[PDB]
Amino acid sequence: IVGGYTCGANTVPYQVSLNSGYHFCGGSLINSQWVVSAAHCYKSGIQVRLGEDNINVVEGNEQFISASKSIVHPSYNSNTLNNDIMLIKLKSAASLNSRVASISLPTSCASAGTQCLISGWGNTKSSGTSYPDVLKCLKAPILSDSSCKSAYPGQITSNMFCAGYLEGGKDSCQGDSGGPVVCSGKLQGIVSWGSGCAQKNKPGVYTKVCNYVSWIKQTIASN
Ligand SMILES: [Ca+2]
């Protein structure tokens, strides 16, 4: 996260770190056994880390659970990042408490202008490189469809939305991928892509979760 702030330990209790020997992507806990992330975060040998603040120190509230199964969206396109969504099942159920908690799925899609909370352990620099140890947060608004498509002509599907600041300086970045965008208490987005981070006229692009709620529900009911 570029130009964000320190969240505060366990104030975002649905935030997970995906670990394959090192943190590489975020995710969201949506019930005691399931995590939503980005399909481009796919890899084998995922361990899901819940209750994290400092991802390099064991602070006492963590739960480390291996994934039993990953399921990339059937229509995921790795060229365009259309349908950039994946489900991860945990080998055992997480214990839910004040520090580990699920986030609700949306019943209806979010509206342009709505302020949302984006979080992760990704790069905090615009052009350089610095990765944080504690969880970073950012408030950012959903941008109109028209301004999104203007920023990224010929690249935006109806399964994507833009959020952020056209003036630049505030954005998600690499290492935040797969993490949450939470608006009005619902998971509305997944950190997907962007042209650089925090650049003028290049806002963040997010997977539009409300288009996938049927697929998530049926997949969880069968696996
Ligand atoms: Ca930790």
Domain of 22, CATH number, reads 2.40.10.10
Tell me if residue 53 is catalytic: no
59 marked as part of a ligand binding site = no
Hey, how many other C-beta atoms are within 10 angstroms of the C-beta on 37? 29
**154 and 64 in a common domain:** no
Q: Which domain holds residue 200?
A: 1-12+103-210
174 marked as part of a ligand binding site = yes
**216 and 194 in a common domain:** no
- Alpha-carbon span 85 to 208, nearest angstrom: 9
How far does the centroid of ligand 1 lie from the alpha carbon of residue 50, in Å? 9
**149 and 95 in a common domain:** no
Resolution in A: 1.5
How far does the centroid of ligand 1 lie from the alpha carbon of residue 218, in Å? 33
**59 and 142 in a common domain:** no
- Alpha-carbon span 116 to 98, nearest angstrom: 21
**109 and 200 in a common domain:** yes
How many structural domains does the chain have?
2
**141 and 54 in a common domain:** no
Do 133 and 57 contact (CB within 8 A), yes or no? yes
52 marked as part of a ligand binding site = yes
- Alpha-carbon span 115 to 134, nearest angstrom: 23
Strand runs labelled E in the chain: 5-6, 15-19, 23-31, 34-37, 47-50, 63-72, 86-90, 115-120, 136-141, 160-163, 180-183, 186-193, 204-208
The CA–CA distances, whole Å, from 37 to 14, 145, 168, 190 equal 12, 23, 25, 7
**18 and 8 in a common domain:** no
**149 and 176 in a common domain:** yes
**107 and 45 in a common domain:** no
**201 and 114 in a common domain:** yes
Tell me if residue 184 is catalytic: no
- Alpha-carbon span 94 to 167, nearest angstrom: 40
How far does the centroid of ligand 1 lie from the alpha carbon of residue 72, in Å? 27
**35 and 111 in a common domain:** no
* Catalytically annotated residue among 84, 102, 119, 176: 84
- Alpha-carbon span 9 to 37, nearest angstrom: 21
Q: Which DSSP symbol is given to 217?
A: H
73: Cβ–Cβ under 8 A, 6 or more apart, which residues? 39, 83, 84, 85, 86, 212, 215
Strand runs labelled E in 51-155: 63-72, 86-90, 115-120, 136-141
User: Does residue 81 come out as left (phi exceeding 0), alpha (psi in the -120 to 50 range) or beta?
Assistant: left
The amino acid occupying position 82 is N
**129 and 36 in a common domain:** no
The amino acid occupying position 75 is S
